[PDB]
Amino acid sequence: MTEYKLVVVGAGGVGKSALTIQLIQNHFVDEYDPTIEDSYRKQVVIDGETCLLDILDTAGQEEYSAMRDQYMRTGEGFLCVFAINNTKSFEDIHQYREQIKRVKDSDDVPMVLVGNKCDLAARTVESRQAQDLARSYGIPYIETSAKTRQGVEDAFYTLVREIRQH
Ligand SMILES: Nc1nc2c(ncn2[C@@H]2O[C@H](COP(=O)(O)OP(=O)(O)NP(=O)(O)O)[C@@H](O)[C@H]2O)c(=O)[nH]1
Ligand SMILES: [Ca+2]
Ligand SMILES: [Ca+2]
Ligand SMILES: [Mg+2]
């Protein structure tokens, strides 16, 4: 049994908590309670390997973000989340990527770009734009919905598969 330390980052309200809770607890959180710093742990079998996921759900709200960098340091792979109906959250990804590079002191950190809320039709970030951003970082882009479960396993398990490539 291997442990994978995953960290979920991104702007306030994009659905980091809802994603993590859908993965771990199999329900959708409809309300919006801003996070400070929460952790989740679960044993899961991923590609035939029994492993322990330790997931750090981080704050996106500036007001709640004290010491996020000290949490982020510990991470082995990052889910960089934006919402497909929130163009500013997508623009913000560059700054999260810069933060991750600064806390890991590496240009080569396991990451997945996640476009969440794909159940919603008020899309302002087209798939291709995010594909392009992810291509520039040499990482995958995956769309998710914490509400329907679309892509949610695939996002987190892809991040583990990325960690295994480094
Ligand atoms: N339709 C839809 N709503 C979503 C989805 N994911 C999250 N939401 C909603 O968006 C709001 C914010 O979600 P939440 O998970 O709290 O966002 P967050 O990124 O963790 N916010 P913070 O950074 O403040 O902790 C909630 O009302 C939640 O139900 C999704 O995939 N689809
Ligand atoms: Ca609910
Ligand atoms: Ca550093
Ligand atoms: Mg949250």
Author numbering: 1 to 166
Quote the study's own text.
Ras function as guanine nucleotide-dependent molecular switches regulating cell growth, development and apoptosis by cycling between GTP-bound active and GDP-bound inactive forms (Ras·GTP and Ras·GDP, respectively). 31P NMR analyses revealed that in solution H-Ras in complex with a non-hydrolyzable GTP analogue, guanosine 5′-(β, γ-imido) triphosphate (GppNHp), exists in dynamic equilibrium between at least two distinct conformational states, called state 1 and state 2, which are characterized by different chemical shift values of the nucleotide phosphorus atoms, especially that of the γ-phosphate group6. Because association with the effector molecules such as Raf induced a shift of the equilibrium toward state 2, it was thought that state 2 represents an active form capable of interacting with the effectors while state 1 represents an inactive form with a drastically impaired affinity to the effectors.
We solved a new crystal structure of H-RasWT·GppNHp at a resolution of 1.56 Å by using a crystal with a space group R32, which was grown under a condition distinct from those reported previously. This structure corresponded to state 2 as judged from the presence of the hydrogen-bonding interactions between Thr35 in Switch I and the γ-phosphate of GppNHp. In State 2* and State 1WT, Tyr32 was found to exhibit alternative conformations presumably attributed to its flexibility. In State 2*, Tyr32 adopted two distinct conformations, (a) and (b), as shown in Figs 3B,D and 4A. The side chain of the conformation (a) formed a water-mediated interaction with the γ-phosphate of GppNHp as observed with Tyr32 in State 2 while that of the conformation (b) formed a direct hydrogen bond with the γ-phosphate. In the other alternative conformation adopting the conformation (b), hereafter representing State 2* in this paper, WAT189 was missing and the Tyr32 side chain showed a shift in its orientation and established a direct hydrogen bond with the γ-phosphate oxygen atom. In State 2*, the side chain of Gln61 seemed to acquire more conformational flexibility due to the loss of the WAT189-mediated hydrogen bond with the side chain of Tyr32 compared to that in State 2 although its position was not so much different. Moreover, the positions of the Tyr96 and Gln99 side chains in State 2* were almost indistinguishable from those in State 1WT and appeared ready to accept and stabilize the Gln61 side chain at its position in State 1WT when the conformational change of the Gln61 side chain has occurred during the state 2 to state 1 transition.
